[PDB]
Symmetry: none
Subunit: 289 residues, 6 copies
Amino acid sequence: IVRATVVQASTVFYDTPATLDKAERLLSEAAENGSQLVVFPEAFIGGYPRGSTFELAIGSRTAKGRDDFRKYHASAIDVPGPEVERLALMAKKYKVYLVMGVIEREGYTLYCTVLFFDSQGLFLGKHRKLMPTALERCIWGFGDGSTIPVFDTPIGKIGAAICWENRMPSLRTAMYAKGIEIYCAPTADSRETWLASMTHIALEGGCFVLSANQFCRVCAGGSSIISPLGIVLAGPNYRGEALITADLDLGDIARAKFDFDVVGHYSRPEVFSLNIREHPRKAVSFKTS
Amino acid sequence: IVRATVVQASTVFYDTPATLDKAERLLSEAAENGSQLVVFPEAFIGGYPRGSTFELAIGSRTAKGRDDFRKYHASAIDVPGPEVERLALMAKKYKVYLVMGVIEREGYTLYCTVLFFDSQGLFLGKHRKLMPTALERCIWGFGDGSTIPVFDTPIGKIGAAICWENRMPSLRTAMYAKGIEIYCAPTADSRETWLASMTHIALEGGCFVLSANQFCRVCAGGSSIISPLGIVLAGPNYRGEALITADLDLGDIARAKFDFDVVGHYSRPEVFSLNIREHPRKAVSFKTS
Amino acid sequence: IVRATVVQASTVFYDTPATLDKAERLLSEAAENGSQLVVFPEAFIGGYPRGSTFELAIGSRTAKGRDDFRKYHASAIDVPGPEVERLALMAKKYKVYLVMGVIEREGYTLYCTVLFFDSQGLFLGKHRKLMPTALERCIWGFGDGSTIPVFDTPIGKIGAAICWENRMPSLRTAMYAKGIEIYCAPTADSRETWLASMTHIALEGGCFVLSANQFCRVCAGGSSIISPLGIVLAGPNYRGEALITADLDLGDIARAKFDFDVVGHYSRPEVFSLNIREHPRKAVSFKTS
Amino acid sequence: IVRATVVQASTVFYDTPATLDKAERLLSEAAENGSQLVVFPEAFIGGYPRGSTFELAIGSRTAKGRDDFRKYHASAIDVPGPEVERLALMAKKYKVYLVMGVIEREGYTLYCTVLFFDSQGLFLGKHRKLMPTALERCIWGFGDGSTIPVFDTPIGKIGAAICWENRMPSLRTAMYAKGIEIYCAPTADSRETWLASMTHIALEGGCFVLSANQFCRVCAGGSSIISPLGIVLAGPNYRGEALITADLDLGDIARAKFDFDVVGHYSRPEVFSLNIREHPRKAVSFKTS
Amino acid sequence: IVRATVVQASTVFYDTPATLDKAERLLSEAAENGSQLVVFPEAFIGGYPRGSTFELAIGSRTAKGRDDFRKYHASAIDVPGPEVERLALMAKKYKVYLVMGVIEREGYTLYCTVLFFDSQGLFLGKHRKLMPTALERCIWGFGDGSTIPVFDTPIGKIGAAICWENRMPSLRTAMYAKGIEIYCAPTADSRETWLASMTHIALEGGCFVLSANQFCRVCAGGSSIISPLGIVLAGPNYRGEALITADLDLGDIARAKFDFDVVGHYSRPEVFSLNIREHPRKAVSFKTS
Amino acid sequence: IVRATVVQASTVFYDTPATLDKAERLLSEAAENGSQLVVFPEAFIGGYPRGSTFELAIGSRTAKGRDDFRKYHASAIDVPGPEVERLALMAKKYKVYLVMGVIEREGYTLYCTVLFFDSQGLFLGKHRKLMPTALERCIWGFGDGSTIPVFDTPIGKIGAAICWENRMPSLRTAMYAKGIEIYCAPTADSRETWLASMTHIALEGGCFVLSANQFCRVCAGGSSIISPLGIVLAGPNYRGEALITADLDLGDIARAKFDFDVVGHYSRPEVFSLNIREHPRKAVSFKTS
């Protein structure tokens, strides 16, 4: 039996070493009640530009989109670097597992990735975003196949997905085949749609769906946590920003997969068959001796 | 622009020529307000045995399960036969499209299939059930791959699925690749779970999800109809049995697939790939000359 | 020795059977002076929405973007269909080679492709666009690798590329390895940049670069034709819309590849090496017997 | 923000310790206005024999080509030696970065290389020429793969290329993958061709293209400097020989890679892939103990 | 014991189907005295442009070099094609082994290759030239490593080399390690130098050196044949053009390798060691499925 | 410009302090005409036993081979000792460079080495023979790899080789990689073969080949000197024994390496590669402290 928390705070959107101590004080306030797993929302460190359009008509490209883009580009981080060593030292002080939604750069690009940290201050890996949704295609980049993680821990197996990757059927049945039972999912929207779209994943899976959204000033996001029977433990807190905690019974999965049981004993292999091509493909590959 | 109805009535569960005139009077009452498409619930003609256990412990097989099974077996139909000619003559009198959830027999077996009829009294085809859920495995049979239909009509393309086939990800992304925009789904359960599980399909698709459940005496089923933006047109009528009608705007799909757009321009073919084996496999195959 | 023409006219942007007779009267006026190859601009049949933004902020998705998208979606064509049979019958009447920049649909998507037709009314093939540039990612789709053509004719080998595919180095050195010497390139921009960017391709290649742009009311596009020595035959006509013709000496290529000579005898294979993966990848693949 | 200069002077073509004080007085005159980076043309120290043919018919080899070749061979330098110590002491006196186009010897051969020097009088490295163009194959040699530099400085990353290496697509997309943003390119030709061929590199890249050519008596070379938006800062000075200066805004690159963005987020790795073999290969390799 | 012939005739240098019947009448006149192996000189089919300079100063590139190059380019062949089928049918009529020095094209390039044919009309392979000498670098191309042949026959093992590949030490000790005992060597020069340079190869080897040169009007070439003891069988015929024949004793090799014996029992492997990298490297490599 | 001499005299074959004053009087007669470099033949001091067989059948070993071997063994020298101090004092009297072909002993063995002396009476080094030819294997020994010299002088770089080491290709391309331009080569044979075998080395190299042979009573050896263009300066003097002199133009090498140019810019490093293992290996190695 473990217990996990989600947060709902917002970033200051500029001056990225100043939005890193908010993470420290929230991590300490989430530490003082004996928690074990902390989930941060989407695009927490880099900042999520809401409402801005960058003045892109069809290819007009006015002068006041370029300066806006460089002011947004100068406030991103890069891995591994000085901004992940401090997070490793943050999670190294005591025992907690840490996920974090950051925005990284790689040679004048922007990838909306997510990070993973264990209780011993190691760096497990990262999961980039597969495809940005509608207008984020203009400013962000596409992830490859060699990124989808397993990340087995002594409290279970944890995975992640971002805003509208949870609507694909093929990515979810590729997560289910690796054995996910704690399924984190940050996002950046706030509708009645989202709770009804997460109840289906919590029923189709068997995993404790653990979402997180931010609250700024208005797009009042509501985070929650859902049992694998369809029972909301902690409700959709639209009432300001706060901390949300609940406990997780890991024996409520083998009693929940008695009815449905995806990629085992349903999902007839005699008619359906899937295959995922997972290659680290890169454009230019130097080879020396 | 079309308009479609669902019904919520129950069968008398025995004496199957007597439960066929209820269908006639409901079809006439659904005709008198200018409807165009009528959907009947799961296992309407054959009857759905609720609560019965047939006394199956592990293989004890007491004497009062066999007589119960033969009394249930003697009240099923077979296609094509005298019970589908009357339904073709029923839909042939005026202009309406007809789906129907029956229970067929094929050599001392039971298949929980669904039927399709056009406005001219023809027999389009049928869709058997892929896999029964938990206890229906004891009494019913498994469907093959060569059954999933397209069934293009001059009002659109209509498909179907049964109780817990709507939770598979692979079957839904096999329905989406054929171009479904009117997605009927009968069922035999009544929870808060079911409305939240259909909102996800109506959002992931772009299809007018049109469910149907029965009401008997208690398992008060609630049928509805959901827009492809996540807007319930007619609510979950738990208040007795009645008729439910709404209209369908077919221009609300090309404006709804601007955001998400499954198996087109999402669903990266460079990493994921699916293939469905659709063969008519049978055990014994006689060949003559 | 052949001679080829480019056009500079614009479409009426709506009611796509009405913009198809402008093509007929321009094709006849380009026929009456003994031409042999006619090139039409980018997005001629489907229409190129200039200046419109569809109101996409970050994911706000107001109501007046959806109706704008469906009014744009209802004015596209699909191949093969009734709109390419008329173009085949158009090019079948007399002897001319025909390229054409259309916009096709494939299941509520939009691909900005280009077509090819011979002198006998056959359908050679098509070349979809690899990646749309900045804001066209929101509304259009991505092409695959199994599309890049050779299309050998008895007047030479002709290829094509679209607006900002001509800036990639890898795609141009994949075109050069197949033996292109007549290199059509429609576009949708009008700067001093574009003439200086085509002179480099005409020098790096050895191919008669033959561009085409449209003129509407203002984005006064200028089409031209460039010798493989860097000598502009017909200038950048910014003076309204008109027809532009010149003749092509096919013996001015073997005398032009005496100096530079790309993928032969330059481009050291002992240090550089390229490989193109050209597979027809699709998401769902039905297989029967 | 840095500022850089190019020169346009010519050598005296013989007596190579006498053409080294012209470099001193030009370096001092370029020092007195607060410059930071000085670029010298192609083959400045060794001399570039223009118009001479050496009497090579097909292999006739008359007597008056051998004495001409030895008089040209006796006026070359060798690295490291007494001619680079004086250049290091020249750049060591004050703070300036120095590139220089020399001609080196290595055992009765001639390599047309280029040199690099920092502000502290160190020797960073050198970049030999990959392949000479047409007639220089008779007298010069070929470079290997283990020579292409990165050379990161505290004012950016600087690279180089020579006369007709800038027309290869593979070498430029091998320079782009290492992160070049100041792209020096000496040459030895003077056409209208060259400005139109450098505008394409400045647009395809994002780098401040900084060319240099010489002026002797006539082949009036014209050097320039081009912004990464396609805006010529200092024009093609055909009016005698002079000094040319401009300033460089390093924030005009992250605002310029918002549209195109080569080897990031364009250049689809799922279809194209490149690999460069970078080995120091030599004919005879002695090994001892 | 075999017997072999060399020829000394010249080509008409233009109209390449007319210089192919001279080969027929010489092949018949060499057939009528019971010969078994016929060797033709360097660049026999394509023609060897002697004395022409193409007006290449340093990169001036006057107009009367381009037309000269295209008139030379239009008189070359390509393998496999219609010009090697006739040579296979020529050698297929009776029993003779055939080598032939042609000039091939491969996409506006020129490779000075050599061909091989057996007694049954098959096509064994080809040997391109490794590096052209001084001025032929301007017009011809470089061969790769995956071309050096063995070509075992029932009369021995035959190899080949071209004009100044016979002066390299590494290529000859790569030929010796494969077991060459009949070593053909066409050329295009006529000095006292050449006989003294072939006596050394015939002594260092053990192979019957069998050279061939052409005679036109003056560069009076002289072909010969040398025993592996240093004994000229047929002298350097400077007296016009004619046929030259001699017989070959294959037992004069195992009695000749009693003294010297290269890559066996000399050539100390404890101090010297060689390795040849033999890879088929090409610039662009398409891969499909 | 230097000038060098070779001698052609013979030894008295016994009583080795008596054959050392012949060297003195020949060195003085070669001094009196202003020479600068004197070359002595193979096995001058120790004596070269011609025609003797030592009665070695297969291993019969008669008594009159042992006394013949000890009478030959008692007339050899050892380095460094009393016989090289007198030669150093001989070359120390005036300015001349001295090479000398001696026979040394090392613990009842015989090595056919060659010596080197400068103008100041120093001892530069020695070059033992790699492998004796046919019958000299019975009486002489094998040299190792750590012996091949460079020996740079202020008149150039001088090297050496002995009788049939000049036929190996690997040893000559190991001499060429160190920069030899004066290539001494004593021998002990007299054929027409030898002049034709040295013309190839003088052409393949660029070095003034300077051979020397002895004349006794008949094996009339003929020494010569060959320009690096293939022009014999002083002919093959078969007319008794005498002194042979000529002058050497060191500017006739950089004009001679314009055509061919071995281990530079020919000898493709991308396909061929050589490596020489140069270790001082000895059987028993005492180590103390």
